């Protein structure tokens with residue numbers, strides 16, 4: 001939630017495309033939801049892992065090491 005960012009994007013494509021094409025196109029992402037606009041366009045919402053935030057968060061589970069952002073290091 002803080003570990004993944006939610007995005008909505010706009011996609012234009014050929015009329016011949018189906019749901020599966022958009023799922024394939026965005027397969028690098030999580031929680032993909034298509035909101036069709038018309039024959040050749042859709043909004044797509046998705047979740048993108050935030051690898052830096054995840055590395056920081058995961059460090060809390062280890063006593064031996066801690067990762068923090070430069071901002072947290074300051075504050």
Ligand SMILES: C[n+]1cn([C@@H]2O[C@H](COP(=O)(O)OP(=O)(O)OP(=O)(O)O)[C@@H](O)[C@H]2O)c2nc(N)[nH]c(=O)c21
Pocket residue numbers: 014015016017018019034035036037038039040
């Ligand atoms: C499923 N689908 C929907 N559209 C466009 O979106 C309009 C309404 O889409 P719809 O009534 O077929 O599904 P809806 O979006 O309501 O619900 P969903 O299937 O659960 O997402 C259609 O009139 C088309 O213009 C689509 N357009 C293309 N090109 N390919 C598709 O597979 C497709």
